[PDB]
Design an enzyme around this catalytic site. Structure first.
Site, PDB file in Angstrom:
ATOM      1  N   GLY A  66      20.102 133.093  77.240  1.00 29.16           N
ATOM      2  CA  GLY A  66      18.661 133.152  77.163  1.00 29.16           C
ATOM      3  C   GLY A  66      17.953 134.544  77.451  1.00 29.16           C
ATOM      4  O   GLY A  66      16.873 134.509  77.615  1.00 29.16           O
ATOM      5  N   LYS A  67      18.924 135.544  77.692  1.00 29.10           N
ATOM      6  CA  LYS A  67      18.569 136.906  78.014  1.00 29.10           C
ATOM      7  C   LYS A  67      17.482 137.487  77.106  1.00 29.10           C
ATOM      8  O   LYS A  67      16.414 137.875  77.583  1.00 29.10           O
ATOM      9  CB  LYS A  67      19.729 137.756  78.297  1.00 29.10           C
ATOM     10  CG  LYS A  67      20.468 137.282  79.508  1.00 29.10           C
ATOM     11  CD  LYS A  67      21.740 138.057  79.508  1.00 29.10           C
ATOM     12  CE  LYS A  67      22.853 137.521  78.523  1.00 29.10           C
ATOM     13  NZ  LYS A  67      23.993 138.408  78.467  1.00 29.10           N
ATOM     14  N   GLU A  79      22.656 146.560  71.247  1.00 26.12           N
ATOM     15  CA  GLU A  79      23.890 145.708  70.382  1.00 26.12           C
ATOM     16  C   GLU A  79      22.998 145.342  69.180  1.00 26.12           C
ATOM     17  O   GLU A  79      23.162 145.805  68.147  1.00 26.12           O
ATOM     18  CB  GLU A  79      24.630 144.953  70.921  1.00 26.12           C
ATOM     19  CG  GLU A  79      26.199 145.099  70.773  1.00 26.12           C
ATOM     20  CD  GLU A  79      27.033 144.780  72.269  1.00 26.12           C
ATOM     21  OE1 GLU A  79      26.895 143.850  72.708  1.00 26.12           O
ATOM     22  OE2 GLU A  79      27.678 146.085  72.327  1.00 26.12           O
ATOM     23  N   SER A 120      13.127 131.731  64.820  1.00 28.97           N
ATOM     24  CA  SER A 120      13.714 130.473  65.201  1.00 28.97           C
ATOM     25  C   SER A 120      12.600 129.741  65.667  1.00 28.97           C
ATOM     26  O   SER A 120      12.387 128.688  65.814  1.00 28.97           O
ATOM     27  CB  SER A 120      15.033 130.722  66.291  1.00 28.97           C
ATOM     28  OG  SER A 120      15.600 129.388  66.488  1.00 28.97           O
ATOM     29  N   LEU A 161      12.351 139.577  94.852  1.00 29.26           N
ATOM     30  CA  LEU A 161      11.067 139.991  94.132  1.00 29.26           C
ATOM     31  C   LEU A 161      10.551 141.013  95.559  1.00 29.26           C
ATOM     32  O   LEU A 161      10.157 140.435  96.522  1.00 29.26           O
ATOM     33  CB  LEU A 161      10.069 139.231  94.047  1.00 29.26           C
ATOM     34  CG  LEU A 161       9.922 138.221  92.762  1.00 29.26           C
ATOM     35  CD1 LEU A 161       8.626 137.539  92.731  1.00 29.26           C
ATOM     36  CD2 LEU A 161       9.959 139.177  91.460  1.00 29.26           C
ATOM     37  N   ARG A 162      10.775 142.320  95.451  1.00 28.82           N
ATOM     38  CA  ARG A 162      10.291 142.976  96.629  1.00 28.82           C
ATOM     39  C   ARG A 162       8.861 143.025  96.634  1.00 28.82           C
ATOM     40  O   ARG A 162       8.269 143.620  95.647  1.00 28.82           O
ATOM     41  CB  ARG A 162      10.991 144.632  96.309  1.00 28.82           C
ATOM     42  CG  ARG A 162      12.175 144.769  96.622  1.00 28.82           C
ATOM     43  CD  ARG A 162      12.942 146.048  96.063  1.00 28.82           C
ATOM     44  NE  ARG A 162      14.169 146.167  96.586  1.00 28.82           N
ATOM     45  CZ  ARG A 162      15.102 147.126  96.034  1.00 28.82           C
ATOM     46  NH1 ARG A 162      14.607 148.064  95.128  1.00 28.82           N
ATOM     47  NH2 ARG A 162      16.282 147.290  96.374  1.00 28.82           N
ATOM     48  N   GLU A 176      19.142 101.362  76.483  1.00 28.33           N
ATOM     49  CA  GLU A 176      20.289 100.402  76.509  1.00 28.33           C
ATOM     50  C   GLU A 176      20.463  99.671  74.941  1.00 28.33           C
ATOM     51  O   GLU A 176      21.297  99.527  74.609  1.00 28.33           O
ATOM     52  CB  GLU A 176      20.190  99.410  77.612  1.00 28.33           C
ATOM     53  CG  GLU A 176      20.168  99.956  78.859  1.00 28.33           C
ATOM     54  CD  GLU A 176      19.971  98.901  80.069  1.00 28.33           C
ATOM     55  OE1 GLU A 176      18.972  98.185  80.196  1.00 28.33           O
ATOM     56  OE2 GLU A 176      20.967  98.856  80.807  1.00 28.33           O
ATOM     57  N   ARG A 206      17.102  81.344  87.867  1.00 28.28           N
ATOM     58  CA  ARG A 206      16.682  82.665  88.056  1.00 28.28           C
ATOM     59  C   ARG A 206      15.728  82.402  89.139  1.00 28.28           C
ATOM     60  O   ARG A 206      15.117  81.377  89.493  1.00 28.28           O
ATOM     61  CB  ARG A 206      15.795  83.209  86.829  1.00 28.28           C
ATOM     62  CG  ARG A 206      16.718  83.805  85.729  1.00 28.28           C
ATOM     63  CD  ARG A 206      17.117  82.927  84.628  1.00 28.28           C
ATOM     64  NE  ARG A 206      18.432  83.208  84.099  1.00 28.28           N
ATOM     65  CZ  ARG A 206      18.869  84.370  83.431  1.00 28.28           C
ATOM     66  NH1 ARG A 206      17.850  85.133  83.012  1.00 28.28           N
ATOM     67  NH2 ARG A 206      19.819  84.474  82.828  1.00 28.28           N
TER      68      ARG A 206
HETATM   69  N1  ATP Z   1      14.995 127.250  67.829  1.00 28.39           N
HETATM   70  C1  ATP Z   1      15.806 127.203  68.832  1.00 28.39           C
HETATM   71  N2  ATP Z   1      15.795 125.901  69.421  1.00 28.39           N
HETATM   72  C2  ATP Z   1      16.777 125.593  70.449  1.00 28.39           C
HETATM   73  N3  ATP Z   1      17.689 126.693  71.020  1.00 28.39           N
HETATM   74  C3  ATP Z   1      17.438 127.739  70.342  1.00 28.39           C
HETATM   75  C4  ATP Z   1      16.835 128.101  69.415  1.00 28.39           C
HETATM   76  N4  ATP Z   1      16.946 129.482  68.925  1.00 28.39           N
HETATM   77  C5  ATP Z   1      18.045 129.859  69.874  1.00 28.39           C
HETATM   78  N5  ATP Z   1      18.325 128.935  70.723  1.00 28.39           N
HETATM   79  C6  ATP Z   1      19.514 128.997  71.724  1.00 28.39           C
HETATM   80  O1  ATP Z   1      19.217 130.278  72.583  1.00 28.39           O
HETATM   81  C7  ATP Z   1      20.484 131.014  72.429  1.00 28.39           C
HETATM   82  C8  ATP Z   1      19.842 132.518  72.265  1.00 28.39           C
HETATM   83  O2  ATP Z   1      20.380 133.248  73.403  1.00 28.39           O
HETATM   84  P1  ATP Z   1      19.651 134.499  73.119  1.00 28.39           P
HETATM   85  O3  ATP Z   1      19.629 135.278  72.000  1.00 28.39           O
HETATM   86  O4  ATP Z   1      18.084 134.492  73.660  1.00 28.39           O
HETATM   87  O5  ATP Z   1      20.012 135.779  74.227  1.00 28.39           O
HETATM   88  P2  ATP Z   1      21.569 135.394  75.218  1.00 28.39           P
HETATM   89  O6  ATP Z   1      22.145 134.331  75.119  1.00 28.39           O
HETATM   90  O7  ATP Z   1      21.052 135.681  76.545  1.00 28.39           O
HETATM   91  O8  ATP Z   1      22.439 136.705  75.242  1.00 28.39           O
HETATM   92  P3  ATP Z   1      23.427 137.185  73.888  1.00 28.39           P
HETATM   93  O9  ATP Z   1      22.787 138.326  73.227  1.00 28.39           O
HETATM   94  O10 ATP Z   1      24.712 137.762  74.570  1.00 28.39           O
HETATM   95  O11 ATP Z   1      23.725 136.217  73.001  1.00 28.39           O
HETATM   96  C9  ATP Z   1      21.291 130.434  71.411  1.00 28.39           C
HETATM   97  O12 ATP Z   1      22.713 130.581  72.388  1.00 28.39           O
HETATM   98  C10 ATP Z   1      20.918 129.095  71.178  1.00 28.39           C
HETATM   99  O13 ATP Z   1      21.533 128.076  71.814  1.00 28.39           O
HETATM  100  N1  ATP Z   2      15.234  83.356  73.125  1.00 28.18           N
HETATM  101  C1  ATP Z   2      15.737  83.298  74.322  1.00 28.18           C
HETATM  102  N2  ATP Z   2      15.592  81.926  74.812  1.00 28.18           N
HETATM  103  C2  ATP Z   2      16.173  81.628  76.037  1.00 28.18           C
HETATM  104  N3  ATP Z   2      16.487  82.667  77.050  1.00 28.18           N
HETATM  105  C3  ATP Z   2      16.718  83.856  76.556  1.00 28.18           C
HETATM  106  C4  ATP Z   2      15.995  84.303  75.020  1.00 28.18           C
HETATM  107  N4  ATP Z   2      16.371  85.718  75.189  1.00 28.18           N
HETATM  108  C5  ATP Z   2      16.841  86.202  76.357  1.00 28.18           C
HETATM  109  N5  ATP Z   2      17.026  84.970  77.047  1.00 28.18           N
HETATM  110  C6  ATP Z   2      17.695  85.112  78.572  1.00 28.18           C
HETATM  111  O1  ATP Z   2      17.291  86.120  78.960  1.00 28.18           O
HETATM  112  C7  ATP Z   2      18.453  87.406  79.332  1.00 28.18           C
HETATM  113  C8  ATP Z   2      18.211  88.508  78.494  1.00 28.18           C
HETATM  114  O2  ATP Z   2      18.044  89.290  79.622  1.00 28.18           O
HETATM  115  P1  ATP Z   2      16.851  90.666  79.373  1.00 28.18           P
HETATM  116  O3  ATP Z   2      17.033  91.148  77.769  1.00 28.18           O
HETATM  117  O4  ATP Z   2      15.635  90.045  79.818  1.00 28.18           O
HETATM  118  O5  ATP Z   2      17.299  91.996  80.153  1.00 28.18           O
HETATM  119  P2  ATP Z   2      18.197  91.897  81.668  1.00 28.18           P
HETATM  120  O6  ATP Z   2      18.665  90.760  81.902  1.00 28.18           O
HETATM  121  O7  ATP Z   2      17.048  92.451  82.626  1.00 28.18           O
HETATM  122  O8  ATP Z   2      19.151  93.238  81.341  1.00 28.18           O
HETATM  123  P3  ATP Z   2      20.244  93.439  80.448  1.00 28.18           P
HETATM  124  O9  ATP Z   2      19.751  92.632  79.047  1.00 28.18           O
HETATM  125  O10 ATP Z   2      20.721  94.706  80.037  1.00 28.18           O
HETATM  126  O11 ATP Z   2      21.337  92.697  80.947  1.00 28.18           O
HETATM  127  C9  ATP Z   2      19.546  86.408  78.985  1.00 28.18           C
HETATM  128  O12 ATP Z   2      20.720  86.727  79.635  1.00 28.18           O
HETATM  129  C10 ATP Z   2      19.219  85.010  78.611  1.00 28.18           C
HETATM  130  O13 ATP Z   2      19.702  83.940  79.809  1.00 28.18           O
HETATM  131 MG    MG Z   3      18.414  94.676  79.123  1.00 25.66          MG
END
Ligand code: ATP
Ligand code: ATP
Ligand code: MG
Ligand code: ATP
Ligand code: ATP
Ligand code: ATP
Ligand code: MG
Ligand code: MG
Ligand code: MG
Lengths: 491, 74, 62, 506
Positions: free
Chosen positions: D38-39, D64, D76, D212-213, D305, D438
């Site tokens: 990003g220089k 360059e 960009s 930063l001096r 998730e 629960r």
């Molecule tokens: N619109 C954009 N959105 C997200 N990332 C961008 C975008 N444009 C450029 N980049 C990113 O920024 C970088 C550009 O680096 P830059 O041209 O600023 O100089 P440098 O990497 O420090 O030195 P050099 O001249 O050796 O490449 C790219 O490697 C790219 O990942």
């Molecule tokens: N329609 C439904 N009727 C009765 N019980 C239900 C119903 N839907 C979900 N459940 C119950 O709720 C639970 C779902 O978990 P929930 O989506 O609330 O999130 P969590 O348990 O906190 O996290 P994770 O889903 O990632 O495990 C199930 O295990 C089940 O026992």
């Molecule tokens: Mg869940």
């Protein structure tokens, strides 16, 4: 030739599996490694196998070692090169320097050699060539850029010539660059790296095919051994999950156990007996190995915890006469400390001894004894290799595992055998009234039904006597029961 | 091509030249360089990264005897 | 033109997602890696798909 | 301002804070970094902002990159450097080599450059100068001692001319020497290091002012992202502790709960929901968000998730129609794999979405989802970020967390995002008579009284029904309690015989 790349089999145990067919024909294959990795051996065994299997003549070019010695050393693997040199099947083209000379003869000789070489190729109708230590040639006074051009010229000429070459290079670091000049890498169509890793004062040689231009191959490092029969590679990953499975049963040596296993052990299956120290594993193995000799079948006993003589005493002290078993050439005991080899070597000795005795059963006493010191993964990789070979070989195997903790053990195998084993027999110490009594249990059987009871068993001079279940206890498994002595319904 | 007897600075310029002339030609090129350390310099001379407008790094990292191929747009 | 940089599809599976469009038109792309990494292949395939997908002739300097 | 050196603002979001005000005027700043960090962008943004915001003409020296390219690339981020070069506010001084050149020229050109630059500064009355890739010039054939001299001379003339300069430099290691010749560090008045750390296949860019001096500045590394608007810095450590605090309650979407919290959550308060997998944090989240839409208030739901579909299939099955909340432009759902980026990126996305929608309620379903992979400190930094930005934005927030172990969890958060939280909602599974019931508990509330019981709660199509506490039980939290009874059959409504009616009548 408008077809994919065609390979020429090396016949080097395991190598053709990894390289999916072997070295590509008409191309050079760089095989570098640090001092002592088996480079020289590889190239040799490569030409030799060529001859002794497809009558393909071979041209071996050396730059440092001497023809006398090359032949001298090859005898270590039981083969006479002299004979092949005689019958013009192999022509050792000496290119080493003599105790005296001059200098400033850089690329001066790389031109001549490419001539002396093409000569011996035509002349002997050679199909395979191995150039040992090309590196040692520029090791006169050159730079990375000089070596690339000299290497490219040679490799190129050889490809026109149409030879399937193998060039030996040297490295300095096990995991650093590929070859001394970090240039060879890019000049070869194929690169095979030989490594001799030194971790924990132990040595482990592995082979890797970094690349094969134009085709496919197996990726990564692969353990290998150097024996009297040469380089032996084990592609523990190549092994397929295609093992035969029958419903035939066998006896555990313990009638009552056989019932618990709902009819015995499956001929095709892996058996794991796990329990605290002293629970009786070594006993079961003992009984198991005996039953295979009662039926006049061969069985091997690889013990890693007890000696030959002590295995006899205790055996005899439970009945079973191992002395006879040996004479009747029906039983074979091996014994060796895990510390006397690496898993790579053991796994081999196991396979090797099974081929010279064709066992119908097998007992490894203490899997955990082979887990000693070795990493968890480098171990599992040994279990599958042993569990698998026996499985695809129709052999019934029994493996013993001492659990690091008596009473309380919250897991069968500390290392995690689960799902690699078919039948799990679990022995546990149980404390009943200030007394250390045992208990055996058929934890799991993939085929049959087996018993679900935790049975108390004793040990005598007669062997294992499986009694009953602690039906009136709680937390048995835990190891420190608590009799319920429930006051019935209290009327 | 430079692996005949050159040094970074001489390399940096030669590359700059090639890259430039190609720009004028209006060609969308893909250039191939080699490395020696999976996580060492991006290219052989430690100068190509900074002269190219775009950079792709292909890796074949080891780790536990297995090899894992990855690709990164630097 | 007078806008951002236009890209050219490589058709290499996935790469055109990673590059948010493909390689930048009118410019070169350096692709490096140790021995056995996929360099040559990447270049062959890039020309190829260009041919077989947009009929864009390609030159391969080796 | 009690600093001894005058500074000029980069107007780059977040940099001026880190440097306590911008770059010292009349002095020079080394922005050094590896490849692609990003220089150029920094130096380009440095001149742009100076032109667009303060009408300060700027000079850009490029060694360059071609002037057409510097202009092609800047589009960009939507910048028309061409229109500026035209208005004569920006002047790009091309000193790149020729695609058909010779060799040798890096010292008298260092005197010819100085003079060229002085000419451009005087002609365009320039106040800011950027010098991109000074390194590339000695990259002809030089050694540390020659470089130090030439850099000094250049820098020293610039200082005299009055110009506030930025100089780009390269480096090969992210943590080794600051710049190539290990000499640039010491010649510059200020040093900014840009890094792009690899670490576990992800990429994390940081910005650090090394020196930063004259004045102080923020020490250490700072995460940042390059977006369509240029560099964007997060001074996560410049985040003060002066959030406003109200006694305003709001609903949770669950009547009984609100009672349990002594009258609903505080508007200004971070809420924590933790329990074992399946306990139902995600339900309270759905209920929390729907109530912001039932009162005609916006609310965002960042999901890490569940897909956008599922979130709706499950939400509907609990009643509450998410389809409508979305149409009435009241509820906004996000959705993303924590893996689809790094915390920095994620934290920004969140910040962004919070601006483009002015929420009054935010819910991050599963902090512990974002916890995946990231080290614990890198995670806590994030938790401080989201929990902080929200607190100062009066935005009420519900954070979810899944404890790695159902029943037996000895701690609220395996991460300790405890002291960072005002109210804590703890769900768990209780083992009663061969079944998994629960149990919900308002563990802690800072300004409120909140109910002390560990109630039992059922999940129906209707939603969460908060029943009563397992009074006659011990070892509750354990996961599998022991039923002790001094009673049970005690009143409540004994009166035996025929107490019920059945489907017909009553
Ligand atoms: N619109 C954009 N959105 C997200 N990332 C961008 C975008 N444009 C450029 N980049 C990113 O920024 C970088 C550009 O680096 P830059 O041209 O600023 O100089 P440098 O990497 O420090 O030195 P050099 O001249 O050796 O490449 C790219 O490697 C790219 O990942
Ligand atoms: N329609 C439904 N009727 C009765 N019980 C239900 C119903 N839907 C979900 N459940 C119950 O709720 C639970 C779902 O978990 P929930 O989506 O609330 O999130 P969590 O348990 O906190 O996290 P994770 O889903 O990632 O495990 C199930 O295990 C089940 O026992
Ligand atoms: Mg869940
Ligand atoms: N019969 C044998 N049984 C077991 N190991 C053997 C036998 N013969 C040789 N070896 C082993 O193989 C190695 C021989 O190495 P070799 O001569 O093949 O070439 P190298 O090690 O690749 O290269 P260098 O020229 O540096 O020795 C010895 O280091 C030794 O450990
Ligand atoms: N003659 C015997 N009479 C009664 N019990 C015996 C006799 N011999 C051995 N035992 C019992 O068997 C146990 C010996 O253990 P065993 O040889 O079966 O293998 P292990 O316990 O599985 O493993 P390890 O011996 O390596 O710890 C003793 O602890 C003891 O209780
Ligand atoms: N059909 C195929 N199937 C699977 N893998 C293949 C196939 N063909 C080639 N490969 C793999 O791709 C690799 C070829 O690499 P490639 O020739 O593309 O360029 P490189 O390794 O980057 O550079 P170099 O020219 O030094 O080899 C081989 O090493 C091999 O592992
Ligand atoms: Mg050798
Ligand atoms: Mg034993
Ligand atoms: Mg290539």
């Amino acid at each position: 030739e408008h077809q994919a790349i065609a390979k020429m089999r090396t016949m080097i145990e395991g190598f053709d599996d990894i390289s999916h067919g072997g070295l590509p024909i008409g191309r050079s294959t760089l095989v570098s490694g640090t001092s002592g990795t088996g480079k020289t051996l590889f190239s040799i065994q490569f030409l030799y196998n060529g001859i002794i299997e497809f009558d393909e003549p071979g041209v071996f070019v050396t730059f440092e070692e001497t023809p006398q010695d090359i032949i001298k050393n090859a005898r270590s693997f039981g083969w006479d090169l002299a004979k092949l040199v005689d019958e013009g099947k192999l022509f050792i083209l000496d290119a080493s320097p003599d105790p005296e000379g001059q200098e400033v003869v850089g690329g001066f000789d790389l031109s001549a050699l490419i001539e002396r070489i093409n000569y011996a190729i035509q002349k002997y109708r050679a199909r395979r060539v191995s150039i040992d230590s090309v590196t040692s040639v520029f090791q006169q006074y050159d730079a990375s850029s000089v070596v690339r051009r000299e290497l490219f010229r040679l490799v190129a000429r050889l490809k026109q010539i149409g030879a399937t070459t193998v060039m030996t290079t040297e490295r300095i670091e096990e995991y650093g660059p590929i070859a001394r000049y970090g240039v060879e890498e890019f000049v070869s169509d194929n690169v095979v790296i030989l490594r001799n890793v030194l971790e924990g004062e132990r040595r482990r040689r592995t082979l890797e095919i970094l690349k094969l231009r134009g085709t496919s191959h197996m990726k990564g490092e692969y353990p290998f051994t150097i024996t009297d029969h040469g380089i032996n590679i084990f592609p523990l990953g190549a092994m397929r999950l295609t093992q035969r499975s029958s419903n035939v049963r066998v006896s555990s040596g313990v009638v009552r156990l056989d019932e618990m296993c709902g009819g015995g052990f499956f001929k095709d299956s892996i058996i794991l007996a796990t329990g605290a120290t002293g629970t009786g594993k070594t006993l079961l193995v003992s009984r198991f190995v005996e039953n295979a000799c009662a039926n006049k079948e061969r069985a091997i006993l690889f013990a890693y915890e007890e000696s030959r003589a002590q295995l006899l005493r205790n055996a005899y002290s439970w009945g079973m006469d191992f002395e006879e078993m040996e004479r009747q050439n029906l039983l074979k005991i091996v014994c060796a400390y895990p510390e006397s080899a690496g898993l790579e070597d053991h796994l081999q000795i196991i396979k090797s001894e099974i081929n010279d005795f064709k066992p119908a059963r097998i007992a490894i006493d203490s899997l955990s004894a082979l887990a000693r010191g070795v990493s968890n993964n480098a171990f599992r990789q040994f279990v599958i290799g042993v569990t698998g070979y026996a499985k695809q070989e129709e052999i019934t195997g029994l493996f013993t595992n001492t659990s690091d903790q008596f009473m309380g053990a919250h897991s069968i195998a500390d290392s995690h055998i689960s799902a690699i084993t078919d039948t799990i027999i679990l022995l546990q110490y149980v404390e009943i009234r200030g007394e250390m009594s045992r208990a055996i249990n058929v934890f799991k059987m993939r085929g049959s039904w087996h018993d679900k009871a935790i049975r108390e068993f004793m040990i005598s001079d007669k062997g294992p006597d499986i009694k009953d279940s602690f039906r009136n206890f709680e937390r048995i498994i835990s190891g420190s029961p608590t009799r319920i002595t429930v006051d019935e319904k209290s009327e």
